[PDB]
Amino acid sequence: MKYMITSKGDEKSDLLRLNMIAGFGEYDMEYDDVEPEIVISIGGDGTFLSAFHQYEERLDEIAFIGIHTGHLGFYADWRPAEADKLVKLLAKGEYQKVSYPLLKTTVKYKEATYLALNESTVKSSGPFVVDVVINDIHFERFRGDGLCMSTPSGTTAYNKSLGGALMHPSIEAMQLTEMASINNRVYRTIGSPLVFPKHHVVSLQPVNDKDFQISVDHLSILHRDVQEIRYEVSAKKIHFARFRSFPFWRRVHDSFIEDLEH
Amino acid sequence: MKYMITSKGDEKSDLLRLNMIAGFGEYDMEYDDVEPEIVISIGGDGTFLSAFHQYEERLDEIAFIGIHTGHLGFYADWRPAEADKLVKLLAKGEYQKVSYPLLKTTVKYGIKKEATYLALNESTVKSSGGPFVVDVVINDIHFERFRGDGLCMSTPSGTTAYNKSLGGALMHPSIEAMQLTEMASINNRVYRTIGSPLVFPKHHVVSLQPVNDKDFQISVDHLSILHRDVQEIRYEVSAKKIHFARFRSFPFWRRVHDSFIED
Amino acid sequence: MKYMITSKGDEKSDLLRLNMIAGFGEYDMEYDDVEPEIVISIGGDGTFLSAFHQYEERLDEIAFIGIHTGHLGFYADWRPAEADKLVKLLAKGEYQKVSYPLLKTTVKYKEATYLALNESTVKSSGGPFVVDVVINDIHFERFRGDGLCMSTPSGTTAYNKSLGGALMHPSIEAMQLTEMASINNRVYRTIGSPLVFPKHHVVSLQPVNDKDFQISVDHLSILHRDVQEIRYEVSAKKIHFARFRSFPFWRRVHDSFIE
Amino acid sequence: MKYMITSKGDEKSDLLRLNMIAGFGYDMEYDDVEPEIVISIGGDGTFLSAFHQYEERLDEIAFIGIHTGHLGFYADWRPAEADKLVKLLAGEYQKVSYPLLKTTVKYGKKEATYLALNESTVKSSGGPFVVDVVINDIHFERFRGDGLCMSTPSGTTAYNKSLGGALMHPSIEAMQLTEMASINNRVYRTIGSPLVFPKHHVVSLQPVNDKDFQISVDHLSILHRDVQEIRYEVSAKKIHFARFRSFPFWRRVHDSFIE
Numbered sequence A: 001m002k003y004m005i006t007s008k009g010d011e012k013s014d015l016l017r018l019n020m021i022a023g024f025g026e027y028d029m030e031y032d033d034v035e036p037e038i039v040i041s042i043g044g045d046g047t048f049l050s051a052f053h054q055y056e057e058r059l060d061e062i063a064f065i066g067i068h069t070g071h072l073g074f075y076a077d078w079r080p081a082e083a084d085k086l087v088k089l090l091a092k093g094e095y096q097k098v099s100y101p102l103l104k105t106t107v108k109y110k111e112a113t114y115l116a117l118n119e120s121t122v123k124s125s126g127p128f129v130v131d132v133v134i135n136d137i138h139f140e141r142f143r144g145d146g147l148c149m150s151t152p153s154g155t156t157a158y159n160k161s162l163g164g165a166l167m168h169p170s171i172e173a174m175q176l177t178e179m180a181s182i183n184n185r186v187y188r189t190i191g192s193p194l195v196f197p198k199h200h201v202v203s204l205q206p207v208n209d210k211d212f213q214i215s216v217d218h219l220s221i222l223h224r225d226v227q228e229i230r231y232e233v234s235a236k237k238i239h240f241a242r243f244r245s246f247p248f249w250r251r252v253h254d255s256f257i258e259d260l261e262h
Numbered sequence B: 001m002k003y004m005i006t007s008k009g010d011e012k013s014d015l016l017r018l019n020m021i022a023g024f025g026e027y028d029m030e031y032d033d034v035e036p037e038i039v040i041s042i043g044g045d046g047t048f049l050s051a052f053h054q055y056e057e058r059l060d061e062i063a064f065i066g067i068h069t070g071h072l073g074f075y076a077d078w079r080p081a082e083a084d085k086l087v088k089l090l091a092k093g094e095y096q097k098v099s100y101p102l103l104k105t106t107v108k109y110g111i112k113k114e115a116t117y118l119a120l121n122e123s124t125v126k127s128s129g130g131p132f133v134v135d136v137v138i139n140d141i142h143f144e145r146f147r148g149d150g151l152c153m154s155t156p157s158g159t160t161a162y163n164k165s166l167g168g169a170l171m172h173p174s175i176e177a178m179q180l181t182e183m184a185s186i187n188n189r190v191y192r193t194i195g196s197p198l199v200f201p202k203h204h205v206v207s208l209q210p211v212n213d214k215d216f217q218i219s220v221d222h223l224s225i226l227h228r229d230v231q232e233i234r235y236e237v238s239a240k241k242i243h244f245a246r247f248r249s250f251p252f253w254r255r256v257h258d259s260f261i262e263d
Numbered sequence C: 001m002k003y004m005i006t007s008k009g010d011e012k013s014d015l016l017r018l019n020m021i022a023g024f025g026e027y028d029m030e031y032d033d034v035e036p037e038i039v040i041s042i043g044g045d046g047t048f049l050s051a052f053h054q055y056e057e058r059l060d061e062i063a064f065i066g067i068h069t070g071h072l073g074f075y076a077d078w079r080p081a082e083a084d085k086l087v088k089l090l091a092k093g094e095y096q097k098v099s100y101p102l103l104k105t106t107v108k109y110k111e112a113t114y115l116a117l118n119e120s121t122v123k124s125s126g127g128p129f130v131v132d133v134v135i136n137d138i139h140f141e142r143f144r145g146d147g148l149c150m151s152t153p154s155g156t157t158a159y160n161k162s163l164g165g166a167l168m169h170p171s172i173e174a175m176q177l178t179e180m181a182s183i184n185n186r187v188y189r190t191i192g193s194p195l196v197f198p199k200h201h202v203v204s205l206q207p208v209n210d211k212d213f214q215i216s217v218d219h220l221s222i223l224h225r226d227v228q229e230i231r232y233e234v235s236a237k238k239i240h241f242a243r244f245r246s247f248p249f250w251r252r253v254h255d256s257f258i259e
Numbered sequence D: 001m002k003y004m005i006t007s008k009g010d011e012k013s014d015l016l017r018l019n020m021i022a023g024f025g026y027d028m029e030y031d032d033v034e035p036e037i038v039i040s041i042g043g044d045g046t047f048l049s050a051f052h053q054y055e056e057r058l059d060e061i062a063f064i065g066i067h068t069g070h071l072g073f074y075a076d077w078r079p080a081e082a083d084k085l086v087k088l089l090a091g092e093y094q095k096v097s098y099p100l101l102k103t104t105v106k107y108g109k110k111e112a113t114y115l116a117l118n119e120s121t122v123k124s125s126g127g128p129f130v131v132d133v134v135i136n137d138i139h140f141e142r143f144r145g146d147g148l149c150m151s152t153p154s155g156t157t158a159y160n161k162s163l164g165g166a167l168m169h170p171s172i173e174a175m176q177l178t179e180m181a182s183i184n185n186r187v188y189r190t191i192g193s194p195l196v197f198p199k200h201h202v203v204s205l206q207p208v209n210d211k212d213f214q215i216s217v218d219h220l221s222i223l224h225r226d227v228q229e230i231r232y233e234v235s236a237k238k239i240h241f242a243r244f245r246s247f248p249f250w251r252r253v254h255d256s257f258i259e
């Protein structure tokens, strides 16, 4: 079937990319970059995030595959030495598909919609002060650096560094974590990370400042005259192609704990 | 239908209990503390915790109701003044049922029989005196070697309890999962731990296996007893769920708001 | 003696400033913004930091007084109405001096020294922040996250607290280093815990690849390019406060975060 | 001079112990009653016992730590260097002193005083732990949770570390307070952040309802009934180490947690 391969930029990612295209030359797989069914990412998680947003409009007919050139990633779980096996396994078209939940970021000032794979942070452009609304009701009023709404697969990313909990991707939910919150007498926050299920809307409403630095995954720009920032578990899901059992907790173990065989 | 009422023990709770019983008497409601279909807890979350474990063999045929006599609890929603409105909505059967996930705790010993436990809040494992050292095995795969005070596995509804004090994340009780939080992990070179709380879905099994000491202080909610000659402690989301009689619409996040932020 | 008064810029601060100078000249008080011995800050903690950075060269000859026009701060403690008796006591020279430790920040590439009253943070200029933490000419860890924060004892109740740092009394001559979203994994293992360093201890931050950092000293943040080394140590200079009443540090902490 | 050696219990410690004593068969006499030099073999736990065993004469005793297992913060030296320590001990060495924690327990009778090398903790006797934290005769917060930990500077790398506390260099004469599973709701509001108190500061823990507490001092933990007040302050007494080579505190922290 149709496929394509993305690259990080360095010689290593480019060389391996050309190798796989050559390998698929002995199989009935039409190389296409405008309408593929199998997107392969070579490099790191950042490279995977780019490939996701590059084809976020066709997540329905695309199974993503990750290859890490450097250290082991959570989206890039295939080794460069296993590229030969990858080509032969991809040829038959035999693979189970695994779907991960996504985050729907809606900004209201014209309504814009963004799909997050890892997280969607909201900072200020001075002091960051907003009001957290959960399903059309007041929960708290945040003051600090910002807020981070993470996906299950994204819990191991920025969410982890912010003290958030690690959540298995089989769970369809989203997690809200604080970023350098100041818990004084005036601005009281929950402190603890908050995990929201489907059909739950987290609305971030401004207090006095309308300019907020809204970021989505690997993309961070400045939005102007913002009135409301909505968050909910998107109906859209990213599909992966598995040929080998590589448990999510193993990837967590090999990343943060230890990797004895490497 | 059959029902029973549990009381905290104080005057206000016992007083409210007697009047509710008399209230149900004016309808088709039989008092039965052996096989109740409805269990009403009057007091607090701790009192509600006792009522749960009192009928943990009949959770499939029981809809629980909580009434707080003091401060607001996550299980005891109803106000004592709403007891009159409660006794009538129950008699008519004008209510829906909501279910929260539970935690299954299996304790295996040396070959003596294993013992299983259900938790509404959480289940914790600590040492019997010295250092607490266990191997955390996730789905038959080793994850970390833990050294510290203990480990806490919490239910979704139990996240607002001991879990939160330990730095755990607050989960919505609709989510079928379980959360593992550390209790003062040394987290060094020899005993490297994840640090972050772990949220496990259904059909996932967390195995705690002894390294040296085989005696552990195992706690389930309010109950905490010493277990000797332990070879394995298994955690997994139970297939059994606790059922709540729903009348109003009290948001879980509002209860969190009223308890930790402001009321 | 030779004094001066700084203002936030608002109407309330400027009015109270003029109402203070008028009562100042009523006594033996020569206004001097060149050789001051008493600096009165009117506004908030942010206004106080400005008054501090305005006279870093002569900190050993100046006693500071903070008056909050807005909310109560750890520096601006005096009330807008308590400025009446403040004029009298300040003229007779009865106040006691209280000294707080300061943080020295040196950027290396000809060096560039900075003094901080609250803290000094180092973040990346866009990409990931990866540096090597060197304690006393010995490597301690390789950090990868949003950045690091070296806080003064008096600055612990500020940004340091938000980052999970500890609150230490300003009578302790030390500096505290806290992490900013450390990834803390295999190849970038970090201590996690906030580190408190005494005097004569030097914390050197060294780049790995990118040498462009967003160095921030208190209220200002400069995008330093071509950075080779960032050194932190407890400065020999200390800020002096004119003590009139008795307002305990832990009491100020209680009023802020505990209600 | 007079000396003595304590053992952990395992064969690795007792065998190494007997080998060292034979090495002083110099002008060194084995005296466990009035020693001038105390050598601990095993781990930090073994060292703690040796400390409390000779807390009567801390001013005239230099301690040496040897770890048969993994590296400790008090048990510095590896058994491979045990021989070189013998020749060096028989007296070319300096003396390093670490601060200690004084714990005072009042009842409702007399009072009890204890010295801690690592930390002192106070927990409940079964139910919820609820106390009032009083700093210098001034109320600070009403704590509710598992307990509170007051740690020495050298004890920060122990229980304090696991509780999310800050790491302090043992040259800083202070004490650190950390929380144990604080519920931190609207009725029981706590600071959350660890608190570092200097000398001459008294932290008083006062009961609210229950007066029975599980008070621990280092490795010892006993139940105290009818407690009226638990006072914390930096002790005037210090523990003396016999410094041989140069093993920095931060390097020792690195080898424990970073590696």
Ligand SMILES: [N-]=[N+]=NC[C@H]1O[C@@H](n2c(SCC(=O)NCCc3nc4ccccc4[nH]3)nc3c(N)ncnc32)[C@H](O)[C@@H]1O
Pocket (backbone or CB within 6 Å): A045, A046, A118, A119, A157, A158, A159, A161, A217, A218, C124, C126, C127, C128, C129, C144, C145, C146, C180, C181, C182, C183
């Ligand atoms: N790969 N990539 N590109 C973007 C992804 O990086 C992840 N991320 C980020 S991006 C948010 C940000 O403000 N970064 C500021 C500087 C920075 N970016 C980093 C990216 C990776 C590791 C460290 C970083 N520090 N920060 C952190 C952090 N501290 N620890 C861990 N992961 C982070 C985040 O999930 C984002 O999706």
Ligand SMILES: [N-]=[N+]=NC[C@H]1O[C@@H](n2c(SCC(=O)NCCc3nc4ccccc4[nH]3)nc3c(N)ncnc32)[C@H](O)[C@@H]1O
Pocket (backbone or CB within 6 Å): A124, A126, A127, A128, A143, A144, A145, A180, A181, A182, C045, C046, C047, C049, C118, C119, C155, C158, C159, C160, C162, C218, C219
């Ligand atoms: N006064 N003044 N100006 C500079 C002071 O800001 C204090 N600070 C800062 S400055 C870092 C920054 O630029 N953060 C972006 C969002 C922000 N800026 C703030 C400034 C003051 C209070 C809260 C802020 N949040 N952040 C935080 C934070 N999260 N919690 C607490 N205090 C913070 C810090 O102590 C510094 O000395």
Ligand SMILES: [N-]=[N+]=NC[C@H]1O[C@@H](n2c(SCC(=O)NCCc3nc4ccccc4[nH]3)nc3c(N)ncnc32)[C@H](O)[C@@H]1O
Pocket (backbone or CB within 6 Å): B127, B129, B130, B131, B132, B147, B148, B149, B183, B184, B185, B186, D044, D045, D046, D048, D118, D119, D158, D159, D160, D162, D217, D218, D219
């Ligand atoms: N060695 N020795 N024995 C006494 C010392 O153990 C230190 N400690 C303690 S004692 C507190 C306690 O009663 N914990 C429950 C059982 C326990 N003891 C331990 C000792 C070392 C590591 C883990 C432990 N868990 N806990 C912890 C902990 N989690 N991480 C690190 N160090 C701890 C404490 O500093 C005390 O001085």
Ligand SMILES: [N-]=[N+]=NC[C@H]1O[C@@H](n2c(SCC(=O)NCCc3nc4ccccc4[nH]3)nc3c(N)ncnc32)[C@H](O)[C@@H]1O
Pocket (backbone or CB within 6 Å): B046, B047, B049, B121, B122, B161, B162, B163, B165, B221, B222, D124, D126, D127, D128, D129, D144, D145, D146, D180, D181, D182, D183
């Ligand atoms: N009856 N009854 N209640 C039992 C419930 O107490 C909750 N819990 C516990 S029980 C564990 C324990 O033995 N802790 C030390 C003594 C204790 N018990 C408490 C009960 C409530 C609040 C604080 C407590 N401290 N600890 C804590 C804690 N630190 N913060 C918050 N909640 C806690 C836990 O969810 C358990 O289900």
